[PDB]
Design a protein around this ligand. Structure first.
Ligand SMILES: CC(C)(COP(=O)(O)OP(=O)(O)OC[C@H]1O[C@@H](n2cnc3c(N)ncnc32)[C@H](O)[C@@H]1OP(=O)(O)O)[C@@H](O)C(=O)NCCC(=O)NCCNC(=O)CCC(=O)c1ccccc1C(=O)O
Ligand SMILES: CC(C)(COP(=O)(O)OP(=O)(O)OC[C@H]1O[C@@H](n2cnc3c(N)ncnc32)[C@H](O)[C@@H]1OP(=O)(O)O)[C@@H](O)C(=O)NCCC(=O)NCCNC(=O)CCC(=O)c1ccccc1C(=O)O
Ligand SMILES: [Ca+2]
Ligand SMILES: [Ca+2]
Ligand SMILES: [Ca+2]
Ligand SMILES: [Ca+2]
Ligand SMILES: [Ca+2]
Ligand SMILES: [Ca+2]
Ligand SMILES: [Mg+2]
Ligand SMILES: [Mg+2]
Ligand SMILES: [Mg+2]
Ligand SMILES: [Mg+2]
Ligand code: NA
Ligand code: NA
Lengths: 484, 484
């Protein structure tokens, strides 16, 4: 039921091994444990207690890594907040998660959260003296460790409860797939508030593996850092991968794995990576599975071009249509099972009832298996748009647009975009006149920047079926004029 | 609470990878699952049912690997029988374990067991037609998978219940310690009825790693097999390591890990291996921990010479004397904890109550921890003699000797042996005269070869404490004459 705290045990086993490279800082596992314990001590002085929930709002920094581990050492659930959200979106997640604390810094406006939660500046925190405490020496396998919001298909996101067991099994199953050696070093340049970034911190302490951490993604900095630090592993969404190949015809020799996830990649990009020797491992995974649950090796990447691979060890996948399992190549809903699959959504009894069916999680994605069991994800959802690896839910964007008094009805769908893959376009029926600029200013207070419509169209009615349900796939073809 | 059957998933994932090389003949994971399923179907036709217990009595052969997996595919607990035991010793274990079946071959005297268990000849079995069955597609993590007998300190051994979860976590923790790559291959030339050998079969399917299986250990054949099949990993007890060093001064280039366990090694041997580049990882582990639980890497083998190393990830060790905490360097009983620790001894109420203390397992070994947490096991037991990595319990050997009509009292202690480490000597008080030849003939029917006393001595009294308990340590000193 329990394991020794991973960071604590890792510091006991290999104290001097490097845990984190960040800018000009190198942090050993012994130093990481000491810093996380000290932050935990300072948090306990601000009355944080075992069983509490603490939200984290930070850019990728060493201090963010300390805060996550410090929560674990106190027995406190960590809510990872997306730094690009508007205040309005964060406030809902602070309230819905039951967070009693917000750990952030001066680059965010702490004042507008004072009413809901006790706000703590991580940099001022670390300057304070505090009593020593007895830390939580054990992680309970079925306890919720972290919460991440996603799947806003009804208009508001759901908090995914990720257990310590989920994270352990994700890291173990990935190591069984990719192999692990003492020389491996993993570069993380995507957000730590997504499981793509955060999972590397759990791999780090479980494997005893260095993470090279970047605050932002810059191709030139990443190539320099790979060379300076002998990086062997790197995670990317397809936009990042495309930017890398835009920069160089050759992959750095030390890279043995580019773990690609977070949405579909254009086929010519995968073909060019294979032709030029970039060792891309395409993968399929989500917040609910605590990162990858299916991965595709480069040796199959051309024969199975388009596939996300096979399930990781201990994990399982099937394709069902209306509760009947599908034959090979027959399209249906992707359902997954495994020790890395989330406990449940937080405080969403009805969604949990619908999403789980006898131990399997319904993903809401459509796909098929070929006759050797390789997974092919079909890009057919209209309730989800993926831009630069960031999920966007039309129901959320439509809810915000409807709230404007000039707006009678609203529909949002994804438009092709050479850089971002897809971007949201808005389709409106209006009571009163309103310009695109007005609408964009109105959305800025309520939606993260990547969620706001890149184009607006005006219609007399939107396409609906006989049950009055919006037909989002038909928006791009309806009689419309562009709104300026 | 369950995982897909490891062999089934591994065959699904990498069917063409080599699972087993035996007499240089190759078995892929696809072929291994097919042979294991077919033997399971043949066993079901002999009325073997989910929930039964089957004992296995086989030398190291491919068919013994099939049998273990076939049991898993039927949901049957597998009792691994030591092939060196007398018929008498094996009959006790068949009855104690509740085995309904015995899976063996014509190398063994099957007629002796058919009064207690239904005996099945694996070679005859594989020639039979049988109907297809629905195999058990999942392994229950807390269900007992295998039973192995050990710890005969009361005079009869105890059956260790090893769960699927125990074997999974043993394999994962070892991979996290040693690293794992697609090129790794593991050579096993020690009995599959010990967990030293059996654990490699589970590493094999979980990692997707070839096992090179030898029926016996010959140094020249092991060396030829390493270079022929590019072996990288090999398991050994110290007698095996000494034979290797007598044969060659150079370790084969492909070997990256010699995993040493099963008892203490002479320090000049460990120093010589380090001097000549043999990558020896000394370890501490037992049946009850489903193999290694503490291991030491070559980089510390000089500075920590005599150490067993540090606990594997997820595992823990402490030292206690009289239930009190022991400071570093303070001697006490080694106690261990981890997901690889056995469920319990089978139907041994008093032993389970005495051996488990608040979630920790008392090992019966004495040791201490240095100020960096490295474990030093002190060779101090007199209730256990280790001969060539085989455990010998004086209580068992004394019981056999006492049952002889001429024998009034008996005490067995370990004598130094250059080749085997320790061999048993017997110390006897006699009712009537009896020769050493007659006692040896008597012991042939009741004890495995390595357990039989190599020398007998006759005394008028044996060393005993105030409560008339034998003081086995002091037998060596006693006033005695050799019995010819
Ligand atoms: C793609 C990223 C790196 C782009 O950010 P960046 O700021 O560098 O963009 P630039 O090219 O430099 O230009 C900045 C302008 O572009 C805007 N912008 C930035 N991001 C987006 C965006 N997503 N969509 C639309 N616009 C964007 C900026 O606002 C700016 O605009 P201007 O001011 O100039 O006008 C960055 O977005 C990024 O890091 N994306 C990745 C986020 C992510 O990690 N998603 C994955 C989520 N899914 C999961 O975590 C589960 C699957 C998983 O675990 C996984 C995923 C990937 C890899 C591995 C795994 C795994 O299994 O381990
Ligand atoms: C040491 C071995 C290989 C010796 O056997 P072998 O038959 O090859 O000996 P020879 O020198 O060739 O001479 C043959 C005659 O020698 C007699 N004899 C054989 N063995 C012994 C013995 N142990 N003691 C005394 N005499 C012996 C025979 O009479 C033979 O005569 P013939 O009949 O041939 O004419 C062999 O004994 C051996 O394989 N020992 C290892 C057993 C073992 O596996 N012990 C480990 C048990 N402990 C565990 O499994 C838990 C710890 C663990 O998991 C582990 C252990 C080691 C390494 C790694 C791990 C791990 O954690 O994964
Ligand atoms: Ca500053
Ligand atoms: Ca990672
Ligand atoms: Ca893969
Ligand atoms: Ca953005
Ligand atoms: Ca054993
Ligand atoms: Ca007890
Ligand atoms: Mg950038
Ligand atoms: Mg099996
Ligand atoms: Mg019978
Ligand atoms: Mg031999
Ligand atoms: Na691989
Ligand atoms: Na200590």
């Amino acid at each position: 039921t329990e394991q020794p705290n991973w960071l604590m045990q890792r510091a006991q086993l290999t104290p001097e091994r490097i845990a984190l490279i960040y800018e000009d800082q190198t942090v050993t596992f012994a130093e990481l444990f000491a810093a996380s314990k000290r932050m935990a001590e300072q948090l306990a002085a601000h009355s944080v207690r075992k069983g509490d929930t603490a939200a984290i709002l930070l850019q990728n920094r060493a201090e963010m890594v300390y805060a996550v581990h410090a929560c674990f050492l106190l027995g406190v659930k960590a809510v990872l907040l997306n730094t690009k959200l508007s205040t309005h979106e964060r406030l809902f997640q602070l309230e819905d998660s039951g967070s009693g604390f917000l750990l952030t810094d001066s680059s965010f406006e702490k004042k507008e959260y004072e009413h809901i939660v006790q706000t703590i500046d991580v940099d001022e925190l670390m300057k304070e003296a505090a009593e020593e405490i007895e830390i939580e020496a054990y992680m309970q396998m079925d306890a919720t460790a972290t919460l991440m919001y996603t799947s806003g298909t009804t208009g508001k996101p759901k908090g995914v409860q990720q257990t310590f067991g989920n994270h352990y099994f994700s890291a173990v199953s990935s190591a069984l797939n990719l192999g692990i050696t003492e020389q491996d070093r993993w570069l993380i340049a995507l957000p730590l508030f997504h499981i793509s970034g955060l999972s590397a911190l759990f791999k780090s302490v479980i494997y005893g593996m260095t993470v090279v951490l970047h605050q932002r993604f810059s191709v030139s900095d990443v190539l320099h850092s790979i060379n300076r630090h002998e990086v062997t592993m790197i995670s990317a969404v397809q936009t990042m991968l495309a930017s890398l190949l835009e920069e160089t015809n050759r992959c750095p020799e030390s890279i043995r794995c580019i773990l690609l996830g977070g949405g579909p990649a254009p086929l010519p990009l995968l073909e060019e990576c294979r032709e030029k020797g970039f060792p891309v491992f395409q993968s399929y995974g989500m917040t609910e599975t605590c990162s990858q649950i299916v991965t595709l090796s480069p040796e199959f990447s051309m024969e199975k071009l388009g596939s996300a691979g096979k399930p990781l060890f201990s994990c399982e996948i099937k394709i069902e249509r209306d509760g009947q399992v599908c034959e090979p190549y027959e399209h249906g809903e992707i359902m997954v099972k495994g020790p890395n699959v989330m406990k449940s959504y937080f405080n969403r009894e009805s969604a949990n009832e619908a999403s789980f069916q006898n131990g399997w999680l319904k993903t809401g994605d459509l796909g098929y298996l070929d006759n050797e069991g390789f997974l092919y994800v079909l890009d057919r959802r209209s309730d989800l748009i993926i831009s630069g690896g960031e999920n966007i839910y039309p129901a959320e964007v439509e809810s915000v647009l409807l709230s404007h008094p000039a707006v009678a009805e609203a529909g949002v769908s994804g438009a092709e975009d050479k850089k971002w893959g897809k971007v949201p376009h808005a389709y409106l029926v209006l009571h009163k006149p309103v310009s695109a600029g007005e609408l964009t200013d109105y959305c800025k207070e309520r939606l993260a920047k990547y969620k706001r419509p890149k184009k607006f169209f005006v219609l007399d009615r939107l396409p609906r079926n006989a049950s009055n349900k919006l037909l989002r796939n038909q928006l791009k073809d309806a009689r419309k004029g562009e709104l300026l």
